[PDB]
Amino acid sequence: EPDMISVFIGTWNMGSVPPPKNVTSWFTSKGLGKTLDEVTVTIPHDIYVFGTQENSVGDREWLDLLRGGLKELTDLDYRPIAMQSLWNIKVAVLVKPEHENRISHVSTSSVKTGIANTLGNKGAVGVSFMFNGTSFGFVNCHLTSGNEKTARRNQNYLDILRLLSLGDRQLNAFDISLRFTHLFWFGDLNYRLDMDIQEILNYISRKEFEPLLRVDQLNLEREKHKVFLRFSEEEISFPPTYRYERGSRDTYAWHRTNVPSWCDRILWKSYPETHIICNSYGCTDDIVTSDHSPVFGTFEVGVTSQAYIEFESIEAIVKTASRTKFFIEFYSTCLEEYKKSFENDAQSSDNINFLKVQWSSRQLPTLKPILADIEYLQDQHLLLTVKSMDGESYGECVVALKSMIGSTAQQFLTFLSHRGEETGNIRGSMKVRVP
């Protein structure tokens, strides 16, 4: 029935002590940054997702605290659809009672990413599900600490990306960056500021965040295309959330030392031509039990209620030295089974590192969707993987059917990726024809 839903994401490193009794500000996006402080009448969200780190409250008691807090806030009995914990890294997903019958295909997963000669218990936990016909993944993580450990954090990220098993077994050809309509990845990512302490404190007291954001390690690693390929993060207008003295937010704790940093982050990655708007991204300033401040993010998200596809041609530019033949596998929830193309019938290159690979219409199968309703087909997506004939994918991508419905073929162009690396691009011409 609903066209759109409101999704809340919270991330909080709790610093190994229990929460204060009142965490209302976290739930309602009140504090610093892009906030919902103007809102006078709380509009309860459809889904609340809580990711925590250094959470030393027993699992049952923690879930009870959250459910109890939401009950008091909303007067609704929110339904925990899933929880997953790995050491003190814990995620929970709660939904309005009315939505319980809209949820299906729930899975959870965890991944350990321990590095020698460092403090352990790092990794990630995840939950995925369907809300009617739209799929969601949520990843909560705690990555390697330390100013000098950027490379370790990047490897943690890649290991989580590769090993987290959320979602359908058939989507094994893809990693979690392409398994869901909407993927939220958050946690104590532990990336720091490349600047000395007194200089950082100066900019924080001036509320001049741009010079700090320029030396944020996460931003810098994303710019290098090493992590979070084509994810989004809302603009940061709140002060660094680590490391505070407990009992107030007036003073940062300090021993390059453990400099104040945006450790705690929310990013997202969505299928093309979908509706998602970020309505808040911020931190609280009245929750003072931990050396981190809680971070909130909220999102309005489109949801879709639970014929043939013909290509004129496909051309891929693939980052590879191989000169063999290639084919494509096509997957989608709108297909009864996955389909495969024939060998490419043309290829060329004037670059030792790249290859242009082409499939004419003849080399490409028509795909048959399970339902011919225009409104159904508009919300669907195709997942493509480019494979060699000898056989391991060279690149995956997603293509939206939204603008392709009709009699004449339409252009598409998108990026190929594999294991967190950009591996080229793919383009073509296709249509989704209904009788």
Author numbering: 420 to 674, 682 to 732, 746 to 830, 832 to 875
How did the manuscript describe this experimental structure?
The two main enzymes responsible for PI(3,4,5)P3 degradation are the tumor suppressor phosphatase and tensin homolog (PTEN), which removes the 3-phosphate (3 P) and the SH2-containing inositol 5-phosphatase (SHIP), which dephosphorylates the 5 P to generate PI(3,4)P2. The SHIP Ptase domain belongs to a family of Mg2+-dependent inositol phosphatases with specificity for 5 P dephosphorylation of inositol rings. Here, we report the crystal structure of SHIP2 containing the 5-Ptase and a C2 domain (Ptase-C2), revealing that the two domains tightly associate via an extensive interface. Importantly, even in the absence of a localization effect, the C2 domain provides activating signals to the Ptase active site, resulting in a significant increase in catalytic turnover.
A construct of human SHIP2 containing residues 420–878 corresponding to the Ptase and a C2 domain (Ptase-C2) was crystallized and diffraction data collected to 1.96 Å. The protein crystallized in the P212121 space group with eight molecules per asymmetric unit (for crystallographic and refinement statistics). Each of the eight molecules (A-H) contains a 5-Ptase and a C2 domain. The overall structure of the Ptase domain in Ptase-C2 is similar to the one previously reported, displaying a central β-sheet sandwich decorated by seven helices (α1-α7) and several loops (L1-L4). Importantly, a loop proximal to the active site, spanning residues 674–684 (L4), was in previous Ptase structures disordered or closed over the active site (hereafter referred to as L4-in conformation), whereas in our structure 6 of the Ptase-C2 monomers (A, B, C, E, F, G) exhibit a conformation where L4 points away from the active site (L4-out). These L4-out conformations are stabilized by interactions of R682 in L4 with one or two aspartic acids (D613/D615) adjacent to helix α5 (hereafter referred to as singly or doubly bound L4-out conformations). In molecule D, R682 is half way between the L4-in and L4-out conformation and in monomer H R682 is disordered. Together, these conformations suggest extensive mobility of L4 with a displacement of the guanidinium group of the R682 side chain by ~20 Å between L4-in and L4-out conformations. The Ptase and C2 domains share an extensive interface of 940 Å2, resulting in stabilization of the Ptase. The interface is constituted largely of hydrophobic interactions, with A592, F593, L597, Y697 and P698 in the Ptase and Y770, H820, L822, E836, V838 and A840 in the C2 domain forming a hydrophobic core.
